[PDB]
């Protein structure tokens, strides 16, 4: 059977922000989803079903089909003309990539951006030319691994290209990471009504909400668009909890939620107390 590429460490979906050329060479690498504050992972693949020599190429493609070459660029070790191409270390069959960086393009110099992709023949999915002219979501991209091994006869057999999870630019509020930074109170009674000042990262009044959860219970904070202070702070009212006579502290979860993406932030923790 034909050998295949397998992604064992997806790139983290949010948090990293696409960096402009001017911000320098030391912009950073894109981290793996399974990464964290303690552990620092990186996109990794396994070419299970082959360990010999070969070559690997990585590039950027749009989020939605047809997966056409993206105007942004990958920069870092072994990158050129916007793509990464190097030889697969022949020792192990598991390969990780810790020097991948995304370099966004000035909205201006976009026309030439699609040009370089063309003129350099990147097209991992050979999408017809008429397809790659339209608009491009400059906040969403996906990694594409075009690996190349060798058949028994010793000839180069390029495998099927694989797409990783999407990577959203953090410098865009609607595509960015949600995060509750601090709260002026985290108690409130089990009958709701308590007011809270919540400080968070850039959000948008039209597309945001405070989601309260707990087993067998779901509710939302009450607040209005005017209560969203400069995209960085929200003042809202706690909702009524399940048990009206909830004697004995009950600890629920409170998180930020964006309707458009249905995305949620890591929980904050809150306790509904009796009375």
């Amino acid at each position: 059977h034909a050998p295949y590429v397998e992604i064992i460490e997806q790139p983290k979906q949010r948090g990293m922000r696409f960096r402009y050329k001017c911000e320098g060479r030391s912009a950073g690498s894109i981290p793996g989803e399974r990464s964290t504050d303690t552990t620092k992972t990186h996109p990794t693949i396994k070419i299970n079903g082959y360990t010999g020599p070969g070559t690997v190429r990585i590039s950027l493609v749009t989020k939605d089909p047809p997966h056409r070459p993206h105007p942004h660029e990958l920069v870092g070790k072994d990158c050129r003309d916007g793509y990464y191409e190097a030889d697969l270390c022949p020792d192990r069959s598991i390969h990780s990539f810790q020097n991948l960086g995304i370099q966004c393009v000035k909205k201006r110099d976009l026309e030439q951006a699609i040009s370089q992709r063309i003129q350099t023949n990147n097209n991992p999915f050979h999408v017809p030319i008429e397809e790659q002219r339209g608009d491009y979501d400059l906040n969403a991209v996906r990694l594409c691994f075009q690996v190349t091994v060798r058949d028994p006869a010793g000839r180069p057999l390029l495998l099927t290209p694989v797409l990783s999870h999407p990577i959203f630019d953090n410098r865009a509020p609607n595509t960015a990471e949600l995060k509750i930074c601090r709260v002026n109170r985290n108690s409130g009674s089990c009958l709701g009504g308590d007011e809270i000042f919540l400080l968070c990262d850039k959000v948008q009044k039209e597309d945001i909400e405070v989601y309260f959860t707990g087993p067998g219970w779901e509710a939302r904070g009450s607040f209005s668009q005017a209560d969203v202070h400069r995209q960085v702070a929200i003042v809202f009212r706690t909702p009524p909890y399940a048990d009206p006579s909830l004697q004995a502290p009950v600890r629920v979860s409170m998180q930020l939620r964006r309707p458009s993406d249905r995305e949620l932030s890591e929980p904050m923790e809150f306790q509904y107390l009796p009375d």
Binding site: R182, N184, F197, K202, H229, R230, V235
Partner: protein, 312 residues
């Protein structure tokens, strides 16, 4: 003796500078007296007048050594950075309206500055301090399109160079210069220039409007140390402080300052502090006081908000 006098100073705060890219028609510099329905503007007057006189106004720095500024005055009556008018009737009071301060870019300061220093030496418009000390040559007899030499241009550069580094693109000052008719012909009798109050760019972080939009709590124990969230307009963490204060009866004033660290300022739009101890922690009834934001640098403050201190 003839002398220029400033009738109405420039406003000073609340006027935003505008980049070339923003185009015009965004607003004109208002007089220090600007009002509700009524609008004022910079105003000067030539004393012990001299028939018809020529008046120019240029932008200059706010440093100890007054120099030419890189931004430029635009609007009707302006050209190449300097505004020009002329009061020749029996009327000696000219006013400058619809003036705009063009915000040059950091990477265009030198180019613009230099070309601004020469045009001055040529027109002979105050190269006294404005550019070179001993370049006092031609106090106005610079001659229409009378070329310069290399005995000053090499001197200019050494100036436009060191100055480009000390320029504060955040503030400027207007300098008025009057010229009178001498030995018939035209204007060459310079009347000793005058500098206006400094004008602060409202879009600059170090001069934005200080304000308190909202507070989660407006009362606290005289003991102090109680946490409060304050929602405000853009401020700088290393240059902002919260001042509680109470005016006495003996013309005295007590003050306290919210306690907090820069890390306690959320994206310049909010501050989390702990209240200060009130004057006397032994009061029996609640004592009303005021709270206000204040910028360490300009000592510039915001409108105040009432705060109620109460017993333990």
């Amino acid at each position: 003796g003839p002398y220029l006098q400033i009738l109405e100073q420039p406003k000073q705060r609340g006027f935003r500078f505008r980049y070339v890219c923003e185009g015009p028609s965004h607003g004109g510099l208002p007089g220090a007296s600007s009002e509700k329905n009524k609008k004022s503007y910079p105003q000067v007057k030539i004393c012990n007048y001299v028939g018809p006189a020529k008046v120019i106004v240029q932008l200059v720095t706010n440093g100890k050594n007054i120099h030419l500024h890189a931004h430029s005055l635009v609007g009707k009556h302006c050209e190449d950075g300097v505004c020009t008018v002329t009061a020749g009737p029996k009327d000696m009071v000219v006013g400058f309206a619809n003036l705009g301060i063009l915000h040059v870019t950091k990477k265009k300061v030198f180019e613009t500055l230099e070309a601004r220093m020469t045009e001055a030496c040529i027109r002979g418009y105050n190269p006294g301090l404005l550019v070179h000390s001993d370049l006092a040559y031609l106090q106005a007899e610079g001659g229409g399109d009378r070329q310069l030499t290399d005995r000053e241009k090499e001197i200019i550069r050494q100036a436009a160079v060191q100055q480009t580094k000390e320029m504060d693109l955040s503030v400027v000052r207007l300098m008025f210069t009057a010229f009178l008719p001498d030995s018939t012909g035209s204007f060459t009798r310079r009347l000793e220039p005058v500098v206006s109050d400094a004008i602060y760019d409202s879009k600059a972080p170090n001069a934005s409007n200080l304000k308190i939009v909202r507070m989660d709590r407006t009362a606290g124990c005289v003991t102090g140390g109680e946490e409060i969230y304050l929602l405000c307009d853009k401020v700088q963490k290393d240059d902002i402080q919260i001042r509680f204060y109470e005016e006495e009866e003996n013309g005295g004033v007590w003050e306290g300052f919210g306690d907090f660290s820069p890390t306690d300022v959320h994206r310049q739009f909010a501050i989390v502090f702990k209240t200060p101890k009130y004057k006397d922690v032994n009061i029996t009834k609640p004592a009303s006081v005021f709270v206000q934001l204040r910028r360490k640098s300009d000592l510039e403050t915001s409108e105040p908000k009432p705060f109620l201190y109460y017993p333990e």
